[model samples]
Target: MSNPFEEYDGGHVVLTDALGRHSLWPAGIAVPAGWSVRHGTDSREGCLAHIEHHWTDLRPTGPAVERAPAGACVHELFEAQAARAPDAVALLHEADELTYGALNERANRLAHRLVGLGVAPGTLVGVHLERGFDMVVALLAVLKAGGGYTMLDPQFPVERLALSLEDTGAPLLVTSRPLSGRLTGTTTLYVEPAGNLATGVGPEDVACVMFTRPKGVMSPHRALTGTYLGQDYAGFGPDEVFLQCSPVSWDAFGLELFGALLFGARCVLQSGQNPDPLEIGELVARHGVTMLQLSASLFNFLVDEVPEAFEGVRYAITGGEPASVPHVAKARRDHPALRLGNGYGPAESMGFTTHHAVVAGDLSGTALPIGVPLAGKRAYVLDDDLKPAANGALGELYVAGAGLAHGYVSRPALTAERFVADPFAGPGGERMYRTGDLARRRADGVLEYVGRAD
Candidate 1:
């Protein structure tokens, strides 16, 4: 009987490694160590029938995608998970751990304290705390208090953090003693508030106002749920124990926290703020990490130097830069059991816009494809005239769909300029964000990320 690879036509696939190494692999079996299916053919005039049926859409789309209720928000999802598994471990930082029930109880109490401090719907609560269980609690409490949260990782400079706070017009800043004196122009809650109880805000209200350096973007609960609650790629689920050591950046932090709550997954927090390659591996093995994510460059560095660290991780979703084929190959060979995928998106699109399920032979050639757009999202590789690029021509990448953020906070002109009408959508058309990224659509319909246009 024919096996998985032979089921398709027996053509070779090319593979590349971390150091710009390359190799061609037999299609009949799983390709060797550092490679992905950059391109494949039946060895005919592109005997195309097999790839469509055998191969799959890297970014799975459609209404079938599971998501939070239209009325439910992120805090509510966490509460629901707590209700389902109150005693289950919800967070692990260093040696300490918090159960789902305990964490929610703390968050409820803090949320009430925020309400006492005038945190209500549409309010922006600044969270200036170090990475730890307390930081997570503060964030959830703000959301539960019917207010949007803006993260303030203490790792950032005081000058920069203070400047960003000016834009939020917030009066209440939740933080601990270590960060107390630094906060300016706010009613500081310098201690953990955990006494009163409260419910989460409705989903229609704003959720987070996360800043990426000088600019911040606001997203509603629906857009957030759209990004986190469902889809394929890594297949995060209830059984997942994610080792979330990524710096408290918007994409990594949001994916770690919400991805766990939506699925009742256990999230292992790595609050030391920085972990070398060896430490990362220890974290995975120590916490029995089932899910992991990091920037593409860092992932490659670790894969080259500490491939054994990923031994226990089931999903290693790397992005924020072009992925390395040699690095990916090393990772697969070292941890042959797990799945690796490439995630791509701009901060404006929440977290991820596309995914390429990377295996031993999934990526080939010099340029790796960024896979397809997420479900409910449309990605168009358009030319200079703002029209779709010819069959194989290169152009700017424009993104449309549910995942788009509301726009930059307090930057209307920049928002208006970057987000424009989707001419492809119709008469006036829904809005689509003009990603400055350059890309191309291959004849087979997959997106190939070229480079930044500006």
Candidate 2:
């Protein structure tokens, strides 16, 4: 028999059984019970390919750290762009174009008002807004005023948002008058009016913080800027128009917004709470997006819903995890000119540890490596003795670079122990952080595959 699924139209997949399993089944083959798709799909060639490459006990690793926040600060860089091209369009929204001068002034005035209400450097303010131009303005305002802004999504539970506000100890929160209802026992600021207030801080001061943690760690300009200004793969530039997807609060957001602003690229914000692949395609067609960054899962979805979304896109980067072999093959088959890349790293290290430009086609079971580090960073696969891992052996990867944060807020010794190592300073020199990141909460301060979004 030449296999039952030889002509199944619904699509076939390989399923590994329950106990500790593996099996290739027809698309409509009802499970004989107790089996799971061990990460396989319709193509036997592709499914077997996935199993062969990913069945190993090893994971791939990546980089550099350049210093200083690029072009002064994130908000300042965007403001400067606004200053030079005050009349130039800096953001595009629902049939609306916001000029740099307009956006800058808007952030400036909002910052002033924020200052008048006690927002300042080192202050962890809450940003509980939806996906829109308002959210962008709030971020710029908070940074301009030198406060560590926390992103609070309303889609999240009222209880979860409350927990986040509690975690940040952020007394004051910014939101639209409509969304203010979610605030309880917390101070709320509305974004409807623009007030010209004055505020000052060292450009090197902590500009932003992320997540709701038992402890807080914020990034100064040195840490935040290096991640943007330095790059090996997607070197964002002035003329590029980045399709701004994903939420602002994520570490991934570091590159999504500032990467473009720091490099003077135009941003087209998709105005929706949770945008689907189809909407993203529409946004790309409408905005003429040149660059985009996404997670591996979403990237695959995009290829499914809107294959032509990459028509004018020059670069498409994926983080969180590596892209599947089939995803790469299909995307390549459909969009040849679209350059695909991978970014790997932890939140502590800011953006990426490595960037690998993926080659199109010719894939058959083997997986791709994450490639190498970004500019100004280095990666070391160290053995158990704290020395570099020998060839053909598995060891932990430690990333060092300027992209690392200063340290934790409350724990000095803990910070020193984790973000503390200075193994080698020659090629890339002392790893900026302990991206080994074993410390979720050692015998001390609080804190993953070191994977996924933090």
Candidate 3:
């Protein structure tokens, strides 16, 4: 009898087990328990080709950071802090400050008002208010009302705001009287507190449906919460004072606002489209601000104009674009104690998926690396076939885990095209976002950003 397993022309089958391991077996052999035929009885060549496409990664699954479980919404995280430290200062704007209890009560009342206006689970509310106490209350209230929010930045043209509202199909635009006059056609709500009420929203619920001009990226509560955990680059506690200065429309605003409130830390709000270096230095000194998340341009400006601004700041992150080495060098020379990090990610990956700390050694390189993925995130530099590119070889970057966005708002085809199945995730794993941005993983696994694929 010919050995069927070794016969070149014999029929074969592809078997998959519990671990997502696949193997070629003779068609005549009995299938083992717990192993099922994934590709049917066919020519050996055909079966081998099926395995090549399906089994892109050979690594076994392992435990990663704990994804947000049910009942864990962003507002609930803030509420927990309120309950824990009711008397702690939660927000500061101008000469005003709100304690955790006060902020919670204000948000609860506004949340009830929103609920009355038909704001419930899956609803997307447009926030048109300027950055202030009212802005914070409006955003938190939307989440508490079991709805996601999309910011309508007043700094942008009125026509752009109108277009965004129309695109999102948001039922209500939360705005103050002065700003309300700018956008006429949409239904608007003025800020007013009602009563304490709560709605059931879980981690999987949509928290934001943000627009980057043409594309609206929807981020679930889990993705936002994931940013707070498994990241050692920044610290959060009752003592940490984070300055909220990023544009209301950007995800960095979420990081600055929620990142502070949810952790029982104090958040000092700055009012402006762009930050002023003098004001920033003064604010840092005044409020004892310990954390900051500035854009690359802002970071460079601050470092050049007011290097002393980083004095009291314990941790600072810069990204939104590539960092300038000379400016980074100036910051390091002026304030060596300040923990500086270079972050990288698109809107689809929330605020940051990967971060690199700018040490003296990094300065020697021509470009600053984007670093490694945070907790609950996986970064893969893969070739066109989706297999890991050789170390240092440029390939398209794919990010998976808790940071992945739900998909584009109302663009299913585009969503499906960009967010592909994760063969590395094994037999029954979640999908990953296919970032068109090109990158390379170094020998030590640090990710270096190359230009876009196009």
Best by TM-score: 3
Tell me the tens digit of each residue's lDDT in model 3 across 1-454: 1223335344777776554555566676555454578888888767767766776533222344355354478888888888888899999988889998888888888888888889998788999888788888898899999999998888898888888778677888889988758987777888873444557777877898777555778888988989875478788888999998887787787778878887899999886755666778888989999998998899998888887789889888997888888888888888878888989888788889899977889887778899999988888987754568898998888898888777676554445445545656653545667777889999988999987876
**By TM-score, highest first, what's the ranking?**
3, 1, 2
Q: Residue 371 CA error for candidate 3 (Å)?
A: 0.9
Q: Where does candidate 2 stray beyond 4 Å?
A: 1-71, 193-200, 212-217, 360-365, 407-417, 425-454
- What TM-score, to 2 decimals, does candidate 1 have? 0.81
Cα lDDT, all candidates: 0.71, 0.64, 0.79
TM-score of each model, paired residue for residue: 0.81, 0.74, 0.83
lDDT of 2 by residue, 199-310 (tens): 5555556676665333445566656777777565875777888766776666787676787777667888876655467877888888888877888888888888778778
* Residue 79 in model 3: lDDT: 83
| Backbone clash count, each prediction separately | 15, 15, 0
Question: Per-candidate RMSD vs. true structure?
Answer: 15.5, 16.5, 9.0
Better of 2 and 3 by TM-score: 3
True-structure Cα RMSD, model 2? 16.5
